[PDB]
């Protein structure tokens, strides 16, 4: 009924009403970095 990944998290599931398999891919994420000249020069920043 359920599949699992190395972390024991759910990898895929079988839909309980219609028996098809759905992959579960966690929603996009990532670190956010701010690129900035010192604030003694400018308050403009770029975001990575």
């Amino acid at each position: 009924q359920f599949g699992r990944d190395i972390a024991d998290t759910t990898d895929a599931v079988r839909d309980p009403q219609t028996l098809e398999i759905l992959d579960i891919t966690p929603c996009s994420f990532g670190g956010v970095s701010v690129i900035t000249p010192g604030t003694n020069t400018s308050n403009q920043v770029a975001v990575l």
Binding site: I6, T9, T25, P26
Partner: peptide, 23 residues
Amino acid sequence: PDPSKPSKRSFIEDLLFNKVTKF
């Protein structure tokens, strides 16, 4: 360096790169 490659590496360097290999 070998000018014919997509990355100008030498013959020997290519050999080295071909030997060393969530949510």
